[PDB]
C-alpha cells in the first residue's frame, strides 16, 4: 500500500485523576457535621450532588453539564 | 475421486439409496412473565 505518514505527536486520552476526595464535609467536635461546597437545585439532583467551585463558576456535574448557579 | 474405484462408488451409492428408503419407509410407520410481576407487586 503506502505504509505510514504524519508529522509526529500522538494524542493521549484522559485520567479521572486519583482523588480520595469525597470527604468534603466538616465535623466539629462530637459530632456535628456541616457541609462544604453547596449542593444543587435541579429536581434530578436530590441535593446529594454538589457544585464544583472554580471562579465565577459553580456547576452541576450530576446533571452531566446542565446548569449555571453562580454565587 | 478416480476412475479406478468407480465400482465401489456405485455400490456404496446404491447402498446409500437403500438407507434413505429404509429411513423413509420406516418413517411412514415407525414407533407467566408479566403475571409474575403482578403477583409479586406487593
Amino acid at each position: 500500500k503506502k505504509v505510514y505518514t504524519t508529522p509526529k505527536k500522538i494524542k493521549h486520552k484522559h485520567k479521572k485523576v486519583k482523588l480520595a476526595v469525597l470527604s468534603y464535609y466538616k465535623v466539629d467536635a462530637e459530632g456535628k457535621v456541616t457541609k462544604l461546597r453547596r449542593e444543587c437545585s435541579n429536581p434530578t439532583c436530590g441535593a446529594g450532588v454538589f457544585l464544583a467551585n472554580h471562579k465565577d463558576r459553580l456547576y452541576c456535574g450530576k446533571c452531566h453539564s446542565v446548569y449555571k448557579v453562580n454565587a | 475421486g478416480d476412475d479406478k474405484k468407480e465400482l465401489s462408488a456405485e455400490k456404496e451409492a446404491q447402498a446409500d439409496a437403500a438407507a434413505e428408503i429404509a429411513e423413509d419407509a420406516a418413517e411412514a410407520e415407525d414407533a407467566l412473565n408479566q403475571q409474575a410481576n403482578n403477583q409479586f407487586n406487593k
Binding site: - | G1, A9, E12, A17
Partner: protein, 111 residues
C-alpha cells in the same frame, strides 16, 4: 463426491423421477476448480415444459477450503401432473382402432 452425488441421483431416480441431474462446481482438495455433471434418465431443457415439470435449486456449500455450487435438477413424471398438462407437447397418441369382423348379409333389426 461421487458417492454422495450418485446416491442422491439414485434416491431421486428411485423416487419415480423421469430423470434428474446433479452438478457440482468449485474446488475439492486441489488448487484448480472443477465441475462434474451426474445425470440419469430423461430431462428436457428448452421451453415452457421446463417451467411446469422441472424444479431446480442451487446451493452454496461453504467448506474449509472454499465454496461449492450444487445445482439439483429434477424432472417429475408428466403423466402424474394432476395439475398442468399431463404430457409433453411432443406427445402424440393414436388410438388402436379395432379388428373388424367384416361385412354381413345386410338384413335388418326390429324392436
Amino acid at each position: 463426491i461421487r458417492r454422495a452425488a450418485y446416491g442422491v441421483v439414485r434416491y431421486v431416480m428411485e423416487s419415480g423421477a423421469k430423470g434428474c441431474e446433479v452438478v457440482v462446481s468449485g474446488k475439492l482438495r486441489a488448487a484448480r476448480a472443477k465441475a462434474m455433471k451426474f445425470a440419469d434418465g430423461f430431462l428436457i431443457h428448452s421451453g415452457q415444459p421446463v417451467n411446469d415439470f422441472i424444479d431446480t435449486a442451487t446451493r452454496h456449500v461453504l467448506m474449509r477450503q472454499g465454496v461449492l455450487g450444487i445445482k439439483v435438477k429434477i424432472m417429475r413424471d408428466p403423466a402424474k401432473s394432476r395439475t398442468g398438462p399431463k404430457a409433453l407437447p411432443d406427445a402424440v397418441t393414436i388410438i388402436e382402432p379395432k379388428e373388424e369382423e367384416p361385412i354381413l348379409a345386410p338384413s335388418v333389426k326390429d324392436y
